[PDB]
Design a protein around this nucleic acid. Structure first.
Ligand SMILES: Nc1ccn([C@H]2C[C@H](O)[C@@H](COP(=O)(O)OP(=O)(O)OP(=O)(O)O)O2)c(=O)n1
Ligand SMILES: [Mg+2]
Ligand SMILES: [Mg+2]
Ligand SMILES: [Mg+2]
Length: 341
DNA sequence: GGGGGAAGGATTC
DNA sequence: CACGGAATCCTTCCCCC
C-alpha cells in the first residue's frame, strides 16, 4: 500500500501573497480578531519570515506584535481560502480515486493502483507539485510512505516546499529514532504522560506492559501507538463526512446575563443553520467558553429533526442550564449541530 | 458487556 | 494577566437492552 499526502504551505498566508505579490518578502501574519478589542484575537498562521521569530499559529495577536511590531497583519478571509482549497482539491482528484480531504489544506491519496514502486510514487509527487504550482501558483509539500501516519510525518520533515519518501527501511529506522512527541495525535499532555513511562521513541512502546500504557494514556492511543511501532498500522483512505456544524463568537464583554447573551446565541444559530444546507440535525449543543477560557456545554438529542425555531427555544433552555450550573461568566457562546438525518 | 446520551478531554486544522 | 473559530475522536458515567 502506498500513500501520498499533500499539505499546502503556510496556506492562508501564501494565499494572501498570491493575491497581493507585494506581501512577498515581508513577514505576514493572518489573524482572527475577536472584535473585543482593536487587536484582540489569535493567529491563524504566519508565513515563514514571521515564523522564524516565534510568531506561530494559536498565539495572541498581541504577543505577535511585541515580536514583530512591523510585520504585515491581515484579517483572515476564510471564504477566499476555502475557494482556493477546493480548486486544488479538484486538481488532486485527477490523480487518484481514493482521496481523503483531511482538512482545509491537506489530503491523503492512495496511489497503490497508479504507481508500481517508490521511485514512481516520487515522480507522481513532483508531477503534482508542478500542477498546483502552474494552475494556482501555490507551493505545497508532499510526503510518501506505506500508511497515513508516516505519509504525514514525511511531509512535516520536508517542509517547506519539499517532497519526501519514507521507504520500508526508512520506516524501521524511524520507529527507533524520531521523538515520540512528533507522532500525529500526540500532544503535550500525552507526550508528558509518556515521558513519565520512559517512552521516547515508538519502539519503546513495545517494552511497556499494555495495561500500563492503557491505564496511563487510554486504550485508543495505546493500540494506535502499538501497531505503529509494530509496522502494522493500516487505516484505509476514506472520504470524510461532516459529523457536526457550528458557530461560536466572542461577546463584547463577559457576562452571565441571559438577555444580554441571547442575541449572540441567535446570530450563531442563524449562521449555523445556513451552513447546514440540506442537512437536518437531531442533536444540538450550546457551547460556552468561560471567562477563564474554560469550555462547557449542554445539549440534547431529539427523536427527530430540529427545525430552526426549535433550536432557538431549546438553545435558550440549554443556556439557562449552563448559567444555573456554572457560577462564572461567559466570554464566547455558540452552538453545534450533529446527528444529521 | 456494550449501544446511545451527555459533559469533559485532548489534538489538530 | 492576554486569549479565535472549527471539527473529530475518545473516555467516564448513566440509562437501558
Ligand atoms: N491553529 C490553526 C492552524 C491552522 N489553521 C488554518 C490556517 C492554516 O494556514 C491552515 C493549515 O494549517 P497547517 O498548520 O496544517 O498548515 P500551514 O500552512 O499553516 O503550515 P505548513 O507550513 O505546515 O503547511 O489551517 C488555523 O486556522 N488555525
Ligand atoms: Mg496542514
Ligand atoms: Mg499547510
Ligand atoms: Mg473543562
Amino acid at each position: 500500500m502506498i500513500v501520498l499526502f499533500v499539505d499546502f504551505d503556510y496556506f492562508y498566508a501564501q494565499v494572501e501573497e498570491v493575491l497581493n505579490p507585494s506581501l512577498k518578502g515581508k513577514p505576514v501574519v493572518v489573524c482572527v480578531f475577536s472584535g473585543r478589542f482593536e487587536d484582540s484575537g489569535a493567529v491563524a498562521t504566519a508565513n515563514y519570515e514571521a515564523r522564524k521569530f516565534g510568531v506561530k499559529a494559536g498565539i495572541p495577536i498581541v504577543e505577535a506584535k511585541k515580536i514583530l511590531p512591523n510585520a504585515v497583519y491581515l484579517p483572515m478571509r476564510k471564504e477566499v481560502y476555502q475557494q482556493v482549497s477546493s480548486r486544488i482539491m479538484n486538481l488532486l482528484r485527477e490523480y487518484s480515486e481514493k482521496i481523503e480531504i483531511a482538512s482545509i489544506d491537506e489530503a491523503y491519496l492512495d496511489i497503490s493502483d497508479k504507481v508500481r514502486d517508490y521511485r514512481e510514487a516520487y515522480n507522481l509527487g513532483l508531477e503534482i507539485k508542478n500542477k498546483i504550482l502552474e494552475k494556482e501558483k501555490i507551493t505545497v509539500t508532499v510526503g510518501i510512505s506505506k500508511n497515513k501516519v508516516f505519509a504525514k510525518i514525511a511531509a512535516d520533515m520536508a517542509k517547506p516546499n519539499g517532497i519526501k519518501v519514507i521507504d520500508d527501511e526508512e520506516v524501521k529506522r524511524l520507529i527507533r529514532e524520531l521523538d515520540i512527541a512528533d507522532v500525529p495525535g500526540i500532544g503535550n499532555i500525552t507526550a508528558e504522560k509518556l515521558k513519565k513511562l520512559g517512552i521516547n521513541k515508538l519502539v519503546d512502546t513495545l517494552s511497556i506492559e499494555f495495561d500500563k500504557l492503557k491505564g496511563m494514556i487510554g486504550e485508543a492511543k495505546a493500540k494506535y501507538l502499538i501497531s505503529l511501532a509494530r509496522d502494522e498500522y493500516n487505516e484505509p483512505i476514506r472520504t470524510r463526512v461532516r459529523k457536526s456544524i457550528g458557530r461560536i463568537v466572542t461577546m463584547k464583554r463577559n457576562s452571565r446575563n441571559l438577555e444580554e447573551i441571547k442575541p449572540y446565541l441567535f446570530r450563531a444559530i442563524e449562521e449555523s443553520y445556513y451552513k447546514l444546507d440540506k442537512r437536518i440535525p437531531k442533536a444540538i449543543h450550546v457551547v460556552a467558553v468561560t471567562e477563564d477560557l474554560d469550555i462547557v456545554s449542554r445539549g440534547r438529542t431529539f427523536p427527530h429533526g430540529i427545525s430552526k425555531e426549535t433550536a432557538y427555544s431549546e438553545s435558550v433552555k440549554l443556556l439557562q442550564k449552563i448559567l444555573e450550573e456554572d457560577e462564572r461568566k461567559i466570554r464566547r457562546i455558540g452552538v453545534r449541530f450533529s446527528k444529521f438525518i
